[PDB]
Amino acid sequence: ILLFDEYNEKKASAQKDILIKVLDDGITKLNEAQKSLLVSSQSFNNASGKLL
Amino acid sequence: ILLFDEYNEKKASAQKDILIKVLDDGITKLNEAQKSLLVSSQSFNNASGKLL
């Protein structure tokens, strides 16, 4: 947001590559977080039955 | 001067090529003009002598 107040022609190609990696990365990391959590939730299910 | 008040990323490559051609071109054209003129000047020289 800062380096491209006014278009920076030289860093332009990197900034793009960067925006991609960091975004792409978090996107994956974020996803796995969710799956990890969902699976944890599923864990209690069996026990929850045995309880009843 | 106009189209690049603020850098125009798309036309950037053309503008460059253009600036080159038009400049390169006139540079040649301008040169030949001079030579043409210089030679014209040289023309009178022989006659100028015969006169004297």
From Swiss-Prot, chains A, B:
Cellular localisation: Secreted; Periplasm; Host cell membrane
Protein induction: During anaerobic growth. Weakly or not expressed in most strains. It is activated by SlyA, while it is silenced by H-NS. Its expression is also regulated by CRP and FNR.
Mod. after translation: In outer membrane vesicles, the redox status prevents formation of the disulfide bond, leading to oligomerization and pore formation.
Physiological role: Toxin, which has some hemolytic activity towards mammalian cells. Acts by forming a pore-like structure upon contact with mammalian cells.
Family: Belongs to the hemolysin E family.
Subunit field text: Monomer and oligomer. In periplasm, it is present as a monomer, while in outer membrane vesicles, it oligomerizes to form a pore structure that is active. The pore is formed by a dodecamer.
Record's protein name: Hemolysin E, chromosomal
